[PDB]
Amino acid sequence: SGFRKMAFPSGKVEGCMVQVTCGTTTLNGLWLDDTVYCPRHVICTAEDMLNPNYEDLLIRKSNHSFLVQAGNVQLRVIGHSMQNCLLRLKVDTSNPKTPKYKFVRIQPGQTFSVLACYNGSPSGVYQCAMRPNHTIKGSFLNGSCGSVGFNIDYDCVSFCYMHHMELPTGVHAGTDLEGKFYGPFVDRQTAQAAGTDTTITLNVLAWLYAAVINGDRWFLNRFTTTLNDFNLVAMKYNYEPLTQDHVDILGPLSAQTGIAVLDMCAALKELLQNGMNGRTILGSTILEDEFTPFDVVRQCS
């Protein structure tokens, strides 16, 4: 039974977390083979609080200035580099734990587990979802910068997301492991904003099926509705519109729970237009747009 916030184990990744330092800035690093990735702004001081020139800030730095404390032992930074917003480092020893891996650039709505760390040492791990306007509602703090996101399939860790900034709006922004920021944004403590945010319609619907496979069936109703028709109520409620593509993905939980998707859309369409007033859903008392189809299948298979 049961259902809740569930992240992947962090074993393989914990073995790839290191410490990296530069003057008075020191942030978490991901150490795969012999390379050590980490946010490029690590070389910035209050220089970030303006318009730091990375090219220049960089070229004006050398290896010896990088304190890479891989846990308890300190390696020798044989070199550096720069791949977009990421700072690629090449060191003497290759990591003897480096697990089979890939670098993936997830899409909004997708979910992943994030291993929060401070000075190379992880502390906790939770789940997150690439929100519409490309942000992430995580729990990062002074030094968390460098923490990663990922998913698993035993055998293979697919790295998506590295933490860089926290917008003055309190939300979080980062990149894939190629130094590319998700959504616009820049590693500048300047100017920046977080456009209006939508709700991950599919995730909500997937969660509902979840809430169904585990009792709770009050929200389900007889009235049904259409895809071109539902989308209309979705605009009123900063919801993401529903493609036929999402309908095809819910297909599976649908056939197994015994509830046609467009039907599930009629319940939500209602939930939104009407409300709840007491009757909750799977603990929550709000729609959980933070569980993807596949995420719901994991806990129910």
In order, the DSSP letters of 13-67 are: HHTTEE--EETTEE--EEEETTEEE-BGGGG-SGGGGS---HHHHHHT--GGG--
- Decide if 44 contacts 25 (C-beta within 8 A): yes
Q: Could you give the CA distance from residue 6 to residue 114 in angstroms, rounded to a whole number?
A: 11
Q: Find the catalytic residue in 38, 44, 117, 145.
A: 145
Q: What is the DSSP string of 104-141?
A: ----TT-EEEEEEEETTEEEEEEEEE--TTS-B-----
- Tell me which method was used to determine the 3D structure: X-ray
Is 41 one of the catalytic residues?
yes
Resolution (A): 2.8
φ/ψ (deg, to 5) at 267: -70, -45
Is 246 one of the catalytic residues?
no
Sequence-separated (6 or more) residues with CB below 8 Å from residue 22: 42, 43, 61, 65, 66, 67
Reported as half-sphere exposure (CB side, CA atoms, 13 A), residue 95 has a value of: 26
Q: Find the catalytic residue in 41, 80, 134, 172.
A: 41
Domains of the chain: 1-14+100-197 (2.40.10.10), 15-99 (2.40.10.10), 198-301 (1.10.1840.10)
Residue type, 115: L
Sequence-separated (6 or more) residues with CB below 8 Å from residue 23: 45, 65
